[PDB]
Amino acid sequence: HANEQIIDMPENSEMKSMKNDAFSQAKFAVENYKFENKISSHIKKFFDEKYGPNWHCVVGKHFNAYVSYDSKNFIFFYEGQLAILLYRKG
Amino acid sequence: SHLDKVQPVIKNSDMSVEMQKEVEEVAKKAIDYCNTDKEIATFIKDDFRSRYHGTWHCIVGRNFGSFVTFERSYYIYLYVGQLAILLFKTG
Amino acid sequence: KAVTDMDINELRKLMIGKAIINSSDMQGDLLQEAQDVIQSGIENNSAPVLNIEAACKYIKENLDKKFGPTWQCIIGEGYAYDVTVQNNTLLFMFYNGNLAVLIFKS
Amino acid sequence: NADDQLKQLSALEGANGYVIFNESGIPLKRHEKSISHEKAVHIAALVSDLWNVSKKVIQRDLKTPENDIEVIRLRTKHSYEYIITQSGDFTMLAIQLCGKAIEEAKKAAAAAAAAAVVQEENKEKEKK
Amino acid sequence: FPQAVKDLKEGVEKCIYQNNQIDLLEEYFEGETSEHVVENLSSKTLMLFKD
Amino acid sequence: IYKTSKEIQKSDQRIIQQRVENSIINNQIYQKSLKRKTSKRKVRHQANKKNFQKEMSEVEDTLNRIKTHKTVLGYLIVNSEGGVVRGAFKDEEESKNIANSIPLLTKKARSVVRDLDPTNDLVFLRIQTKLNEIMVAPDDEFSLIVIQTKG
């Protein structure tokens, strides 16, 4: 039930919506698409229009990954059973 | 001559014939080895798990109805006497 | 009268709506939603003669839409089974009479 | 010839029904008083599990070589008795009752006959 | 099949006759208690009050 | 006086233990057990005491009689939890095997009787082998198993 998540986003800098948008987009996208590959494409496309390009998001039920991301642009959260990781590099 | 007598019959089979033949020998061996039906279910799951890695669910009863979501070609259905040996591997 | 008057044939005939839970491993809030759906579905698909395959097909379709894509439930008069399931994903409840129902999430 | 044995089993006092099981577990013949096929399918599965477990247990669990169970009799509550005898590849279950149970059964039969007579009388009255 | 059933029944019939001779599980005067049992009348001083 | 006091105390203790026993004959196994439990201040002596470790001849006496009876290998009591309350066989291996194997068969056998009629409960079960006859009496508290060679 997303007991532990890692949040690294700016607060009260007018970029507060990025954290809110990620939680809202993940819930809506995951239920309708119902595909691991499709969820990553939809989440990346919505974030790209709102906050510009160079955003990489990977969604897997169970996975281990290490990556370098721009500071305050990486958020990790669990949408229901599924786990979605989205970050901006470059 | 008990092995000849049981004559286990697979009503529905969804697996390779070579693998299916192996299941019949294990099913006959499991019934004689296990004192009770509950022991038979545990023995079949343990032998298959060792033979093939994955999650195996096995239910054997005199009368039952089953609908399951198993990996394709990993579900074998065989009936011996009043016992149903059913194994379905789910990923 | 009372328990002495009651017989196994008499008890089954007297009450067909009695619900008994033998094993619980799923969260109680989740169990309440599942219990109402399974009881309603079995009675609707019971028909003239109860069909084990018919009850399972309706339950399997309802459960997949309701919670997760891979949900397996098996109902039989008597059975022995070993099942590996995720935490709080298995609920075991048997209906009055010779009806055992097993529902788990994989 | 084969039919006469079923009639003979009913003739014996204290006998309720007779069920015969094949090696496969199919019930060859069952008594009419007891449920036919549905009960036989349910009785054959239980006896095979019991007979096979007992036969296997005597040879290994008791550590006695060449020892085979010949007859198993289970006495339960009320008048139930379930003698099991295996001949060749066929094993059968016989349900017999005690003297009190037999008397009760006779009384029940008499009551049923009386009820039938009363119904007939009522029908005659209606006709009149 | 024909021979086995007469023979099997015969064996079943033999078992029926032995049990029929005596119930063997009956308990004489089961359940009923002693019923009438002589009781002595008794008197018990509870306390004594004296000036 | 200390000794006297002690004696008095002992006497008092004795009286408390009696009550239901009311002295007289040594009597009763149940009474003795109760006394031991509740008050352990005093024990032994009092009267003749009949035969040591023989509270009741009748269940114990009947078991001794069946064991003494000719053509009976022995009678082993099985605890509801797969245990040997009492074992009376010539060889330990047969008794140990009988102690674990026989109750499992009876429990399986009880279910077979149970499936046909739920109200009906196993009263007595008898299995006859080619060379020996096995009789098992099942109760929730204790199970009695007797092996008698066929005559």
Add this chain to the structure above:
Amino acid sequence: FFQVEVQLNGDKVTLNLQEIQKSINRAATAVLRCSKHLYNWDQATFYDMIACDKEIVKVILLLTGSIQGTKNKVNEFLSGFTKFEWLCKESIQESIKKFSKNGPTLQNYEDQLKKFSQIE
């Protein structure tokens, strides 16, 4: 059941358990008071007779032991609560030292605030 309140007396985590031992002792002493009303028949205190009873002395010892056991169960959650809390100890003396350590990074401020939100 016995109820106790857990707070920070003088800023030190402490429940109201020595007082509970004293309170239970009063109930125990009251039981002894009941034993002294017989007047020893005659025309005379039965309190001495109860003292003379070795078993009565043993019962008093058992009552003291039970109070210690209840306190140990309370100490687990009391100690467990303090361990998470201790990372945020009493006084702002550390804060003045901690504020200087932060220094230049802007994010640095957000990380400490985020921890406080988790603490909240």
Add this chain to the structure above:
Amino acid sequence: HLPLDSFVQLQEEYINSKTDFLTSKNVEVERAVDDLLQTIM
């Protein structure tokens, strides 16, 4: 009364009521003992 300052005071009152009752029984027991001795005499 199995089922703080207030509990102690309430318990003391409950204990006091039992003590008052117990004392009445002691007088009755002594009279009963004397009566048995008087009857024998």
Add this chain to the structure above:
Amino acid sequence: IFDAYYAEIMKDHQIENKKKKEVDQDKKQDQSMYSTSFKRCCKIMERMVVQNDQEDKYHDYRYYWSKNEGHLLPIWRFSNEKQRKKNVTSICWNPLYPDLFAVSLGSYDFTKQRMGLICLYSLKNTTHPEYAFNCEAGVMCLDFHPKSAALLAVGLYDGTVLVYDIRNKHKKPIYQSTVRNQKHTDPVWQVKWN
């Protein structure tokens, strides 16, 4: 499934709550349990062991089926080595149960007098008497009331009249005859129940 279903039915209807509270026997060692439900199983087991050994005799007794000729065959003999001195004397059969018959041992010849034991021999077990009764003098006559099987009439030396109830566990005489009750002298040879 029925057991879980049944327990719920009992909860629904709280009438005559099941008794047989589990105080049991306990005592840890030196004779735990071995007493009332278990006693019934032991009693059944003793008869079954006796039945297998006496199966040839039992089969003949049930139906051996024995022109003006008569054939009599003795089947079993019930006796006690300790009670060998005692004579059989009066014999009676309970009206309620054909299987239960009680023979009260008595001492004949007058000059030799010994205690008489009343033994009720059930047909199910012939090894030893179902009920054993000890009497001060040999029992001349034993009778059973027709209406109630439990009531038993016993006649002994010195004219003492003894009434015994089979149901009572203690086995002491329910009633006795004394000099104040005008008990007759000598020996009461015949005793009957109206």
Add this chain to the structure above:
Amino acid sequence: MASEVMNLSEEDIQFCQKAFSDYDEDGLGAIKVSDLKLALENIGCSLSENDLFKMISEVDEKNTGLIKFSDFLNIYYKQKYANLGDDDQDLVDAFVAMGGNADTTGSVDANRLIQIVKEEFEMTIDIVGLIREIDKDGSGEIEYEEFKLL
């Protein structure tokens, strides 16, 4: 090929015991069922889930080969530690035996005396010590204490 490695023998031996126990067949190979046979015979763990847990954590598994032996080699290392507490008398004794033992005396009696409202304030305590002292050495050892209390 060892290289100066003492290591424990108690456990190292246990594995060999249970191993040859089921491997007695002398097949030279080990299956996933045999590994559970042992625990199934003695009843070490409740369900195969336990043994399977640790084993699975090791790395991977298959049908049958011989490396399965690892189950036992590691099984011994999953036994870990026991500890439980039995009786409440021993504690009482230790409450009085401040030298953390049965031995020494009167000092524990004086500790009881501090805020003691008990009858026979000190004479009764001395009498109790004498009663608890069966062998006349002026002290109550644990055996005397137990006899005294029971």
